[PDB]
């Protein structure tokens, strides 16, 4: 009763316009913690704000992690900077991951929400696995696989193969197997499957799902292509 759950959703959208995602993510973290279930708008504002925020860090991470490999004093300069970003990145993942397991996921009726939030869970654990190093690695790589699988099976029993969310789930999942779990086999396995299955009802995609559905399948396919 402390605060106003609505003004926050507004601040979150006013932050988006001003293109200040760090601010936007903060406003949505506060909204999720209110307990209520996220409406489709609020749910996007959240997914948008955080993917944009962790996005910058993953990108910066690769860039710096690259020039790191390619003097010692000249490399240590780059090494420590990639560790600064890495933890900055690890922080974002942990807030979202917590926001997911503690509020979002356990509190979502719509199966498409349970697979949407769960896709995210699989996603952020994967970004945490990318920059992840050492032993604890194999452990985070597993949290992702499971979160993704727990979602794949839900959509693979609740959504037409033409539905974007399920297509995306297949898309990100397949990528998890390729890059993360070094398994170029299983990689295309679900890629095609979810793609061919989506083509079957392709003539449906009422003028609504239509776009996003195709956009993803394209990526789903673009992936398959450059994987062979």
């Amino acid at each position: 009763g402390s605060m106003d759950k609505n003004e926050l959703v507004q601040k979150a959208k006013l932050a988006e316009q001003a293109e200040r995602y760090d601010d936007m993510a903060a406003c949505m973290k506060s909204v999720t913690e209110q307990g209520a279930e996220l409406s489709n708008e609020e749910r996007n504002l959240l997914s948008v704000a955080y993917k944009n925020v962790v996005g910058a860090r993953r990108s910066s991470w690769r860039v710096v992690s690259s020039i790191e490999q390619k003097a010692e004093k000249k490399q240590q300069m780059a090494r420590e900077y990639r560790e600064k970003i890495e933890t900055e990145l690890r922080d974002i993942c942990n807030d979202v991951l917590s926001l997911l397991e503690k509020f979002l996921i356990p509190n979502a009726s719509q199966a498409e929400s349970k697979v949407f939030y769960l896709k995210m869970k699989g996603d952020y654990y994967r970004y945490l696995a990318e920059v992840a190093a050492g032993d604890d690695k194999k452990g985070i790589v597993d949290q992702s696989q499971q979160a993704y699988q727990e979602a794949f099976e839900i959509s693979k029993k609740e959504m037409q193969p033409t539905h974007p969310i399920r297509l995306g789930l297949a898309l990100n999942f397949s990528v998890f197997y390729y890059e993360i779990l070094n398994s170029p086999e299983k990689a295309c396995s679900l890629a095609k499957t979810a793609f061919d299955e989506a083509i079957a009802e392709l003539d449906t995609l009422s003028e609504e799902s239509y776009k996003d559905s195709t956009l993803i399948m394209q990526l789903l396919r673009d992936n398959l292509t450059l994987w062979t």
């Binding site: 948008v48 996603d123 898309l171 990528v175 890059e179 993803i216 673009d222 992936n223 450059l226």
Partner: peptide, 7 residues
């Protein structure tokens, strides 16, 4: 790298 969801 490989592609993934976006907007």
């Amino acid at each position: 790298k490989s592609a993934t969801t976006t907007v």
